[PDB]
């Protein structure tokens, strides 16, 4: 999925927020890895995406 830079923390066990609460929620018992990267060169429009 794609999110903004500020709420990259919200995708993690034990933290709360609009994205964490409503869009994507991880379980308390989690076994996995999260990979994130900047996509400003790729998904950004001058007019707006």
């Amino acid at each position, epitope marked *: 999925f794609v999110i903004r830079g500020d709420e990259v923390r919200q995708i993690a066990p034990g933290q709360t927020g609009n994205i964490a609460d409503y869009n994507y929620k991880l379980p308390d018992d989690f076994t996995g890895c999260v990979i994130a990267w900047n996509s400003n*060169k*790729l998904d*950004s*429009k*001058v*007019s707006g995406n």
Partner: antibody
Amino acid sequence: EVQLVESGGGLVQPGRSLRLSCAASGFRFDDYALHWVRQAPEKGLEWVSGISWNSNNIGYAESVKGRFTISRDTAKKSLYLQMNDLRAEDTALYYCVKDRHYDSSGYFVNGFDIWGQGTLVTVSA
Amino acid sequence: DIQLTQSPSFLSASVGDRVTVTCRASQGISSYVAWYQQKAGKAPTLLIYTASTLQSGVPSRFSGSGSGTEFTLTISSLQPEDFATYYCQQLHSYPVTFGQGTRLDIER
């Protein structure tokens, strides 16, 4: 093999419409942007139109506004270029091109990767 | 829309030389510049995109750069297949314009 086929061209009289077709083969069609380019003899090339993956961004050149209508359909994997009120300027070789990032412009990286052979459209009496 | 002008309309050249073309715009379109090449009686093919990055399967002789309102496509070495017409395009705004084209010519 990534290939594109254009069809529907021919000789048309002023006051009569036509519909060009742009076939898609060898690549996924639901996520790639498409554009139309026409080339009249010995005056370089000219941009016609450009559509998006989700049919939300549709744009035409101001020279051809109000008379043309671009459309696409995922079921048959084809791009449709619709003519209305054809005139003298419409006599050109029309190319259908395929973009590489599912949207017309605004991105840092864009480009017409594959270019079709093109069909010949002539408007006269 | 942004107006694009090719400084050299025609350029006669020989094998082994260097050829540079200039695409000049009116406003500042950052680095959203690419180039095509059309073969004789054949559909144009992309060579370089973002004015710096080679796409795929393109000879290393082709190169280019661009900053602000100036963009230059440069050919380090010439080959018999190089002889063709080249075009520059803008990508800043939604309307797109193709350049009038620079035709390279053989030497005789």
